[PDB]
Amino acid sequence: IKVRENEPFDVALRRFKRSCEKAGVLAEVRRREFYEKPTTERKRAKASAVKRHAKKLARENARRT
């Protein structure tokens, strides 16, 4: 997070923040995530992942492209 960028540079470049926290503090601990709903919305994000990964193996179809 503590980003100096030497001296001649300035132009923000603080992906250190954006690829670390932000989403964790904000869109998660902003409003009430009802204990059960994570167990639901994770397991569907998790089921959607292997759905794509299993399909990616069988994605090599005829195509003709």
Binding site: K2, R4, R30
Partner: protein, 116 residues
């Protein structure tokens, strides 16, 4: 009168506002400006430009103190901050460093109820 060399610019960038407040080394507040105080009321108050103008309005009204360089301590998420820091250069300061003070509770208080 005083004439401080360096300072710190705390930016409380919420969803609805962006409060810019310039302080000294020991956190002694020297002057401030907001998106709502700049004009920009309602929908306009939550934009990157209405943050920029607030930091420009905070850049002046701290000239009696005569700050050459300052650090940045952004807070909250908001539309501002990735825009407000641009304004502090364009106004006339040197950014020594950029940091966060974004309050991350290690699962502490129950957050408010989810809305629909």
């Amino acid at each position: 009168r005083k004439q401080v060399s360096d300072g710190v610019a705390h930016i409380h960038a919420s969803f609805n506002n962006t409060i810019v407040t310039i302080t000294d080394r020991q956190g002694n507040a020297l002057g401030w400006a907001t998106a709502g105080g700049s004009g920009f009321r309602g929908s306009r108050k939550s934009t990157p430009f209405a943050a920029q103008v607030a930091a420009e309005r905070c850049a002046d009204a701290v000239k009696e103190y005569g700050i050459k360089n300052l650090e940045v301590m952004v807070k909250g998420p908001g539309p501002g901050r990735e825009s407000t820091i641009r304004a502090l250069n364009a106004a006339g300061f040197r950014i020594t460093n950029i940091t966060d003070v974004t309050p991350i509770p290690h699962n502490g208080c129950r957050p408010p109820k989810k809305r629909r």
